[PDB]
Design a protein around this ligand. Structure first.
Ligand SMILES: *C(=O)CCCCCCCCCCCCC
Lengths: 41, 604, 86
């Protein structure tokens, strides 16, 4: 967790972070991208 | 527009022939229609996300803009000169072949790169369930971190780049809200790159989950149109192909199946014994057809399959009648002159072929398992073929014993090894079997309530019955799945049936005192268990004597209901019992909050 | 490992209580080994030329095969049958 500083806009051990799940926003990237023949073109 | 772009090779005037795919040193420019940019953008978007980890580890090469693989050509874009003429596009955005190659191998190369890191980020992320589905629940960050500082095994990648993975993470888990730099406090809202998608997956308390209930429907709709559940009780010849019978090899236990319970299996019900002989491999053996009726697999009405009669664990009393020992058990065909069930004595049996004997007598195949010597699991096995039995009116497959010397001891034995678990496997799907005949088409409606209790369980692997069972079974999972045929909600399924019972019980009341006005509260409830009994055991609808379900209306009715029922579910079908379902989710988040509370104390 | 030695254990046990029907190319049984190709138990069937398993059903009348030579001997199992046929 050693301080970095600019590489990325947020420090991990940074001031006032906060792990806190909300039933409201179910974390998700993009897995189901459609590529099948008919659907991709 | 769509397809490759074309341009007037003959210049100026572009007719349906003065065109030509504008190919060149880069390959052929294919048009990138609006939606197809959504994909390549959605793919690149998911890679750019990992920007902070690409720089950290000096891989990558800057953010991948989809505008680096395309171009701004203009011409007519279609699939063929003729139709491309009706799509004059100006300064459209096309991607040349050689480019369609990089945007491909780039998204592929980068995809590996991230696929790896993305795996480390995960073993650490999910390693503290950042996802609840009712209300909230925090877990003081210090602890959390100082905790994973432990658990995470020394070869992750979340220990070598904490806030190089954290920055990637913040965009995938709206659970981790980074503390704002100029107020040093969270944000209430969480802004992960998947802003919308993640909003529309949360288990919304009004109705289960839109992403769920939506698919469970489109999924069922697929099947309904696919297999051909529609037309499930159609009354007219249908090619077996229409039933896509696959992976279909059912096994039995004959020498038990009554002849009338399944046409493909006749029996030698004759007074005395019918000892015959046959020179097999020099040695002369005697097929018995002993004391009892000895049910044998008939050959006609037997779709050229792969019969594999297994004889194992089954008793082998060579201990008593010594006559039994010494005889090599073997599946043998038996061509009889007079039709079986009319074949009295030996002179009646034309010939007997040992289609597959077992090397080594009955005293090496044995194995003592507490007195009663059993059969060492072995599989005898013919490969019956429709035409190898051409002309031959009577012929039967019999997995008997082939005694090397009949005696008084084997006078009440009857060596039929058919008590074993035989497994026929139709090796030629195109041809089915029904009521004892081989056909190429079924008549669905005919097979409904036409089999008996066991004229079903005794069906022959890939025969109408087994096909008109594999079919109902799909339709049975579409209702079971999508429709709510398992609650007091008088659903579309049990509703289609109720309307039949009414229209039915209503005309049966027409003519005569009509002393009984139709019920309805009783009809709704009777049809509810009818539709329910179906989802339950799809098969039943084939057995003669099943209430409601077996009248010609139903099924033909049911399906076409369930049909339109799926094509309207809405999206919030999940509203069903979305109350207890909700209350159960809060139940979990309360217990998971309890977990975070320890992570929060133990590792302060 | 073409042979599958569970098959060869059925060869010898059919040799001792000789069964070993020797069949020719025209699907008739003989006892001379010179005109014979197919070898039964009658569990398993092996053409003596190519020496591969063909069918587990014997009754070699229903077997398709295409090989032609003048060798696969051991005659020893063939010799062991006629001694054990007594
Ligand atoms: C310094 O690296 C100390 C360890 C603190 C973080 C290491 C990885 C565990 C926490 C992951 C944060 C990013 C997403 C899980």
């Amino acid at each position: 967790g050693n301080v970095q500083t600019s590489v990325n806009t947020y420090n991990i051990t940074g001031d006032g972070n906060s792990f806190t799940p909300t039933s409201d926003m179910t974390s998700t990237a993009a897995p189901a991208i459609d590529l099948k023949p008919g659907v991709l073109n | 527009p769509t397809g490759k772009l074309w341009r007037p090779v003959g210049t100026s005037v572009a007719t349906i022939d003065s065109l030509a795919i504008v190919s060149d040193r880069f390959g052929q420019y294919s048009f990138v229609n609006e939606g197809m940019r959504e994909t390549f953008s959605k793919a690149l978007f998911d890679i750019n996300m990992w920007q902070p980890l690409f720089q950290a580890t000096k891989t990558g090469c800057g953010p991948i803009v989809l505008s680096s693989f395309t171009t701004t050509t203009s011409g007519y874009v279609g699939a063929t000169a003729g139709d491309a003429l009706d799509n004059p596009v100006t300064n459209g955005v096309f991607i040349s072949t050689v480019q369609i190659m990089n945007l491909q191998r780039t998204i592929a190369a980068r995809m590996r790169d991230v696929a790896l890191w993305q795996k480390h980020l995960d073993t650490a992320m999910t390693m503290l369930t950042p996802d609840i589905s009712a209300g909230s629940a925090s877990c003081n960050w210090k602890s959390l971190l100082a905790f994973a500082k432990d658990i995470l095994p020394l070869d992750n990648l979340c220990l070598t780049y904490p806030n190089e993975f954290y920055n990637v993470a913040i965009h995938r888990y709206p659970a981790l809200k980074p503390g704002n730099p100029d107020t040093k406090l969270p944000d209430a809202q969480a802004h992960p790159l998947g802003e919308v998608a993640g909003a529309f997956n949360a288990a919304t308390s009004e109705v289960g989950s839109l992403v769920g209930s939506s698919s469970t429907l489109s999924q069922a709709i697929s099947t309904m149109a696919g297999k051909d559940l529609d037309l499930i009780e159609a009354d007219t010849p249908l090619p077996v192909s229409v039933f896509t019978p696959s992976l279909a090899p059912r096994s039995y236990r004959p020498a038990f199946i009554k002849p009338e319970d399944a046409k493909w299996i006749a029996e030698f019900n004759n007074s005395s014994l019918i000892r015959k002989t046959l020179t097999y491999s020099g040695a002369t053996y005697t097929v018995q057809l002993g004391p009892g009726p000895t049910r044998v697999i008939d050959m006609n009405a037997m779709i050229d399959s792969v019969l594999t009669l297994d004889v194992s664990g089954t008793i082998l009393p060579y201990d008593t009648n010594p006559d039994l020992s010494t005889s090599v058990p073997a599946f043998v065909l038996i061509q009889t002159s007079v039709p079986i069930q009319q074949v009295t004595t030996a002179a009646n049996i034309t010939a007997i072929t040992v289609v597959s004997a077992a090397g080594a007598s009955a005293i090496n195949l044995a194995i003592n398992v507490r007195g009663q010597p059993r059969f060492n699991m072995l599989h005898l096995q013919a490969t019956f073929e429709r035409e190898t039995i051409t002309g031959i009116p009577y012929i039967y497959g019999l997995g008997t014993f082939l005694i090397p010397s009949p005696t008084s001891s084997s006078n009440f034995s009857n060596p039929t090894l058919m008590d074993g678990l035989l497994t026929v496997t139709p090796v030629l799907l195109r041809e089915t079997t029904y009521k004892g005949e081989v056909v190429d088409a079924i008549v669905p409606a005919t097979v409904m309530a036409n089999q008996t209790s066991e004229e079903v369980a005794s069906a022959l692997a890939n025969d109408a019955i087994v096909l008109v069972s594999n079919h109902l079974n799909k339709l049975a999972n579409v209702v079971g799945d999508a429709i709510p045929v398992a609650s007091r909600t008088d659903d579309s399924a049990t509703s289609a049936i109720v309307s039949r019972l009414a229209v039915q019980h209503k005309l049966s009341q027409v003519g005569q005192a009509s002393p009984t006005p139709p019920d309805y509260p009783l009809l709704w409830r009777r049809a509810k268990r009818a539709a329910s009994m179906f989802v339950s055991n799809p098969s039943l609808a084939l057995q003669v004597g099943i209430p409601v379900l077996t009248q010609s209306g139903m099924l033909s009715a049911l399906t076409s209901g369930v049909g339109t029922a799926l094509r309207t579910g809405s999206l919030g079908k999940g509203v069903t019992d979305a109350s207890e379902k909700l209350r159960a989710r809060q139940s979990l988040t309360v217990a998971k909050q309890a977990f975070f509370d320890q992570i929060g104390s133990l590792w302060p | 490992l073409h042979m599958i030695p569970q098959v060869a254990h059925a060869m010898v046990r059919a040799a001792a209580a000789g069964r070993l029907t020797l069949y020719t190319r025209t699907r008739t049984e003989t006892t001379n080994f010179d005109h014979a190709e197919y070898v039964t138990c009658g569990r398993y069937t092996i053409c003596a030329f190519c020496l591969t398993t063909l069918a587990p059903h014997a009754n070699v009348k229903t077997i398709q095969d295409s090989h032609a030579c003048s060798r696969q001997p051991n005659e020893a199992i063939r010799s062991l049958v006629e001694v054990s046929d007594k």
